[PDB]
Design a protein around this ligand. Sequence first.
Ligand SMILES: [Zn+2]
Length: 480
Amino acid sequence: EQLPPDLRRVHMVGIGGAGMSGIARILLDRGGLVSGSDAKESRGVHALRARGALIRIGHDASSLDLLPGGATAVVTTHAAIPKTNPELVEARRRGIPVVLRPAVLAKLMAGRTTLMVTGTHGKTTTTSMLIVALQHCGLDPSFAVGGELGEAGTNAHHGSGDCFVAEADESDGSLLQYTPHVAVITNIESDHLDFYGSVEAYVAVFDSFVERIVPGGALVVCTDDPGGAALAQRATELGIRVLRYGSVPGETMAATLVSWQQQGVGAVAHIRLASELATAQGPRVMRLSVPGRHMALNALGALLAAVQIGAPADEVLDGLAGFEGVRRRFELVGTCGVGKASVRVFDDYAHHPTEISATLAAARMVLEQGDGGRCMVVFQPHLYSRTKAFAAEFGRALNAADEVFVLDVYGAREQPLAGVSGASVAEHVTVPMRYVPDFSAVAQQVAAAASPGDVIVTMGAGDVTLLGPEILTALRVRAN
Ligand SMILES: [Zn+2]
């Protein structure tokens, strides 16, 4: 019905980021005044300026005079903006509150039925599936999706509905700012510990989050994941409603993946829903337009979340059938040639060994619908520390491909470690492999190694996504 007083005139430091931009859009659509600052001009800055936001390029204290009567709050994000930023200093000097993005999002979600999706990976896809399912059922939920894949998949919308669907980051402690009515948890793996220092504290963030669920709420949780299954048990012992989904049958399972197959038109799964949800007809068929069995598991999570707020299961399944995937999630970049002899180039954000194995299994199942292609992966390791810790597991996961090109480590503002490179991963791969540390040489080499019917996947969380188009060009030039 209203914005809280602290959110009426908001100045956003780093407003050009996709998450900050979505928050600013929602603020504006609910009658807020927004000013901001960013290091670099971009299309998001232009769009926000066009909607009435006063945005200065570059950070400077004067930006705090843009709003009439001064800013009621300054919104930053600790991951991107340092505490030594001039505008944060000026804000603390005048006594203007400084908040992080998740607190603002929590204030925006207040008064709605909130569906939060978290987990180590698969958050963006599951949140997007849930949003698409709800919209297919005629609803107009508010939402804020994105984060896990960087800018990819990030979007936000102020809706007329009573629901608010949000992706919750678990890598920086944002989880604990939220109060979910329905909490979905895709998995809990031993990663993203850089903020927590230990597996134990990271796992504990999820227990605290589960405790934050409103009375009478529900936790949808994947139980094929070990951390997820343990957390589901712990949550059941707290008295909380627990909707489990996975592949192992059980009396305490809300939804079960009985079978899954990849076909030429798309994927098809057979599932069993608990009799409490939906109807007595036992086995349901769930078709999907996205490849991969793990996508069917994600879809089960979104389905249970949607049913919890009163959407009919069959119509939700219809809506999930039309989900097309998000950017950098086995995303088709392009095709060279036609039919069975065509070479397809895909893009994927996978950077955890489980993600790598899942993506390569999906690629192999896609290949099995063709007539004899090969799977070539172009993998860019994501961090020096991650590479040093996980190189053996990375190479083991990459062994699922027919050919592997390994790029050098993408640093991502991390301090370089002596003795660590992409070759640290390349040492552990058993299948045909090439180490290509020169970025500009990659595309050509891949184009030379391609055969008709091949599936090519650029994989990684950094620069590697830019190689998809180039490869295609280098393939079409090769077509003489
Ligand atoms: Zn990650």
